[PDB]
Paper text:
Notable among these are the resistance to inhibitors of cholinesterase 8 (Ric8) proteins, which regulate G-protein biology in species ranging from slime molds to vertebrates and, in contrast to GPCRs, act on monomeric Gα subunits.
Apo Ric8A1–492 was subsequently crystallized, and the molecular replacement solution for this crystal structure was found using the structure of Ric8A in complex with MBP-Gαt327–350. As in the case for Ric8A within the complex, only a subset of the Ric8A1–492 residues (Ric8A1–422) could be modeled based on the electron density, suggesting that the C-terminal tail of Ric8A is flexible. In both structures, ~400 N-terminal residues of Ric8A were packed into a classical armadillo fold consisting of eight ARM repeats (R1–R8). Moreover, in the structures of apo Ric8A1–492 and Ric8A1–492/MBP-Gαt327–350 conformations of the hairpin are nearly identical despite the different crystal packing interactions that involve residues 400–422. This suggests that the contacts within the crystal lattice are not responsible for termination of the armadillo fold after R8. Thus, Ric8A contains 8 ARM repeats rather than the 10 that were initially predicted.
Numbering used by the authors: 1 to 101, 107 to 201, 208 to 291, 304 to 422
Write the structure that this text describes.
């Protein structure tokens, strides 16, 4: 019932009573991540006892109830440091099957992955220990299996989430997954196998694909040089074809906008040349991207992170393709009939973009200015006529 009671049971208790106490605690606290700051010493003692039992070795019959219990104690930042040790993380990686050093229960694997993700997300010591242990190698191996791997959606999704956490918090793990393991091709293959040409995407496949896109965004944004080779170019073109399929794909559960957002954020980091696959008149992909941008313009709090990647992608598309530039100019800047209305007055797309040119974020200002500049075929008088001096001064002073 109480943490001190369970800790005293685990200290002085037989085989059945400790398991019954942990079972009753897990059943009654499976929906509780917060704890009162009064039983903190008892919780720390229980956590240290559980860590001592974990480093010693758990019996194969008593793991699911144990790890889950640990998960309940992983929800406490005070007890968090009691679990973050090299021996404890080695035991967790061995129970998760990701240690470099036997049958496997999928519930055990899932609970171990949940505990590892909770520790890495909450402890820099835990994320550094995971970086030192090199769990990313075996994680990438298990993910790249994919074909003969009949692992459940929970295990796959939490492997992807652990990869996301490791590549977001540890730059060394991020670079090791990109350069040494060549994780770009592995994740591209995993995304291609996750998509299969189905009309709708299931919820499990949608979650897994969004996690793959997040990991790709974490590993590909500052690791690609300006000039690439033929193999990397072909791999990025295949990834761009997959992302174009995603943009033209709808996801179930009303997650299609989130999936398109993740795919566009991933597109925003690819080499500009590799954007040639967005066109292979036939501007359906560009129309979907423009509609996505027009819908994302309604965001005000997260406006930058919402519309910067799509605006950059459309800017690079209009810069590298004359037909795409003409199409975007015809769809955004039509020939003006009545020139009495100011560019900063109105609720049209042009007026919204002009108001965004005076946003509080200089990055948003410059991105919108460059986008509207490459739409006017890089014509200074046309850009000043469509936008106005009060809005184009930021771009004019930048160059």
């Amino acid at each position: 019932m109480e943490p001190r009671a369970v800790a005293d049971a685990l200290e002085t208790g037989e085989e059945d009573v400790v398991m019954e106490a942990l079972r009753a605690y897990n059943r009654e606290n499976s929906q509780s991540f917060t704890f009162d700051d009064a039983q903190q010493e008892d919780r720390k003692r229980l956590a240290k006892l559980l860590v001592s039992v974990l480093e010693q070795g758990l019996p194969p019959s008593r793991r699911v109830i144990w790890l889950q219990s640990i998960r309940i104690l992983s929800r406490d930042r005070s007890c968090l440091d009691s679990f973050t040790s090299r021996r404890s993380l080695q035991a967790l990686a061995c129970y998760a099957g990701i240690s470099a050093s036997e049958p496997l229960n999928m519930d055990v694997v899932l609970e171990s992955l949940k505990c590892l993700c909770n520790l890495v997300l909450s402890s820099p010591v835990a994320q550094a220990l995971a970086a030192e242990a090199g769990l990313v190698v075996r994680l990438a191996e298990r993910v790249g299996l994919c074909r003969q791997s009949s692992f459940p959606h929970d295990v796959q999704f939490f492997d992807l989430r652990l990869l996301f956490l490791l590549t977001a918090l540890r730059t060394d793990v991020r670079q090791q997954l990109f350069q040494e393991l060549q994780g770009v091709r592995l994740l591209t293959r995993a995304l291609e196998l996750t998509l299969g040409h189905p009309e709708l995407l299931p919820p499990q496949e949608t979650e897994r694909a969004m996690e793959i896109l997040k990991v790709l965004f974490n590993i590909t944004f500052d690791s690609i040089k300006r000039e690439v080779d033929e193999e990397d170019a072909a791999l990025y073109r295949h990834l761009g074809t997959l992302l174009r399929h995603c943009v033209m794909l709808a996801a179930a559960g009303d997650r299609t906008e989130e999936l398109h957002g993740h795919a566009v954020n991933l597109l925003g980091n690819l080499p500009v040349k590799c954007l040639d696959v967005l066109l292979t008149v036939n501007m359906d992909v560009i129309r979907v991207l423009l509609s996505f941008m027009e819908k994302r313009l309604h965001q005000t709090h997260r406006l930058k992170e919402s519309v910067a990647p799509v605006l950059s992608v459309l800017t690079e598309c209009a810069r590298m393709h004359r037909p795409a530039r003409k199409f975007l100019k015809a769809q955004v800047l039509p020939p003006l009939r009545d020139v009495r209305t100011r560019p900063e007055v109105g609720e049209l797309l042009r007026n919204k973009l002009v108001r965004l040119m005076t946003h509080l974020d200089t990055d948003v200002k410059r991105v919108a200015a460059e986008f509207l500049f490459v739409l006017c075929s890089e014509s200074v008088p046309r850009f000043i006529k469509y936008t106005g001096y009060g809005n184009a001064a930021g771009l004019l002073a930048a160059r």
